[PDB]
């Protein structure tokens, strides 16, 4: 049970995540949206990165914001699953399908980097489908993205989900490039989508971080030369030699006929 039925012209339905994310239908429009609930004391802080970039097809866009007494209700167009769940269910993606989806993922990251943001927490789970047919994806949100103060993308604090953590973060003596780190993560996603398992895995983190530091991963021979070439241009490169999010988009793999 909930205390209210409606926020503005939006009928509330059911919680998708605790008391934080609610389903909603616009009463005049009849369209189904998703409503994320923040405290008014810290909502414009949390949402600051969402107002840095121009709108992009593969980055969730805020539809409306309704300010209550105690809470701010931020509305988004709904999703239809996530990439992680999709890869698990499918086991692995065909190169044709993977190329379509990964191009959208890379485009989203390229938009963030070139607009002066680093994500820091990139995972498959963070990308969610826009349509029922699960052909279009978008970055779920930019809430926890770091806004660069000028050009410099140097980060001191270690961030990331262990599987997506780059070697530069682990054996860091202070600063590292946030953009290079986000690109590393893109490599892991691409591998995981195509192969159906993480490139680096182990029993416990310390052993996992050893494999990453040394670059202990294998690519199946079954993947196409171009697919393999793209993987290694991210995961088997030091930041200075490693592709940028934008450069990924020009890669010959996407241009294949399939």
């Amino acid at each position, epitope marked *: 049970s909930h205390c209210v039925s*409606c926020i*503005g012209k939006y*009928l509330l339905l059911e919680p998708l995540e605790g008391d934080h994310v609610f389903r909603a*239908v*616009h*009463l*005049h*429009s*009849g369209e189904e949206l998703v409503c994320k609930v923040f405290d008014i004391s810290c909502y414009q802080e949390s949402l600051a990165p969402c107002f840095c970039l121009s709108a992009h097809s593969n980055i969730n866009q805020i539809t409306e914001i309704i300010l209550g007494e105690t809470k701010a209700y931020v509305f988004f167009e709904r999703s239809y699953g996530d990439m992680h769940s999709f890869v698990r269910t499918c086991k692995k993606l065909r190169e044709e399908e993977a190329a379509r989806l990964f191009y959208q993922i890379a485009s989203a990251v390229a938009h963030c980097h070139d607009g002066g943001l680093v994500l820091r927490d990139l995972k498959l789970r963070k990308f969610i489908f826009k349509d029922e047919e699960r052909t279009r994806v978008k970055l779920e949100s930019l809430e926890d993205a770091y806004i660069l103060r000028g050009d410099d993308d140097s980060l001191s604090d270690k961030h990331g989900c262990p599987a997506y953590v780059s070697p530069e973060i682990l054996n860091t003596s202070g600063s590292y490039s946030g953009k290079a780190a986000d690109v590393w993560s893109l490599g892991v996603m691409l591998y995981t989508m195509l192969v159906g398992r993480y490139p680096f895995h182990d029993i416990e983190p310390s052993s996992l971080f050893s494999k990453i530091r040394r670059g202990q991963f294998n690519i199946p021979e079954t993947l196409s030369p171009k697919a393999k070439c793209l993987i290694r241009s991210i995961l088997r490169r030091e930041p200075s030699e490693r592709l940028t999010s934008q450069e990924i988009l020009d890669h010959p793999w996407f241009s294949t006929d399939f």
Partner: nanobody
Amino acid sequence: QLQESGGGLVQAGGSLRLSCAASGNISAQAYMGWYRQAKERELVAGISYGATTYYADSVKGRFTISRDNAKNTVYLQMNSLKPEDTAVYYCAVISAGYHFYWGQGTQVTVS
């Protein structure tokens, strides 16, 4: 003042049709839909005055909703009736100062 109809019993795989009308001073822009309890009250189907609809994930493709703005009434056609769908179906009409009218309840069983 919501007068409704259509309650019945049916074999697993059959079909029922529900209907509800309102003859009062309700808004032209008023949203209309059907909830069911059985368990708690969830919205199974809804429809805006511009005919754009919502369906619960469980009943997508199986159930259908439509409103006649002239008569000021809303219908809920349901097919391939599962055993789980057994519940009391309350019609609702919502406006937005703010109004929210319920129906008495139309029972429908599956076996």
